[PDB]
């Protein structure tokens, strides 16, 4: 299941993934809370994202 | 934009 970013997000920690609205993301892990570990299919980068900034596709 | 969630707890 891929997700699409609904907003831009600028990294706020060294472990975050920055992304732009419309980027497509794969969830690597969502077991730890509302911050999900994701991989950008667009940019190739990996990191945590706020789960309320994305929607399923 | 929505408020950010609290950071994950262990």
Backbone angles phi, psi at A51, to 5 degrees: -65, -20
A54, A37 in Cβ contact below 8 A? no
Backbone angles phi, psi at A32, to 5 degrees: -100, -10
Cβ-in-10-Å burial (0-12, 13-18, 19+) of A29 comes to exposed
Nearest to A2 by CA among A39, A56, A38: A56
Reported structure resolution in angstroms: 1.4
DSSP 8-state class, residue B5 = P
Asked whether the beta carbons of residue A52 and residue B2 sit closer than 8 angstroms, the reply is: yes
User: What technique was this entry resolved by?
Assistant: X-ray
**CA-to-CA distance for B10 and B8, rounded, in angstroms?**
7
A54, A45 in Cβ contact below 8 A? no
Cβ-in-10-Å burial (0-12, 13-18, 19+) of B9 comes to exposed
A35, A25 in Cβ contact below 8 A? no
Residue A10 near chain B (CB below 8 Å): no
Q: Closest partner residue to B7 among A7, A35, A52, by Cβ?
A: A35
Name where chain A breaks: residue before each gap, C-N > 2.5 Å. Answer: none
Reply yes or no on domain A1-57 having CATH 2.30.30.40: yes
Asked whether the beta carbons of residue A7 and residue B7 sit closer than 8 angstroms, the reply is: no
Backbone angles phi, psi at A20, to 5 degrees: -105, 150
């Amino acid at each position: 299941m891929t997700f699409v970013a609904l907003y831009d997000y600028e990294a706020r920690t060294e472990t975050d993934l920055s992304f732009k609205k419309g980027e497509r993301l794969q969830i690597v892990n969502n077991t730890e809370g509302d911050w999900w570990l994701a991989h950008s299919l667009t940019t190739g980068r990996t990191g945590y994202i706020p789960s309320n900034y994305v929607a399923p596709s | 934009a929505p408020p950010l969630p609290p950071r994950n707890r262990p």
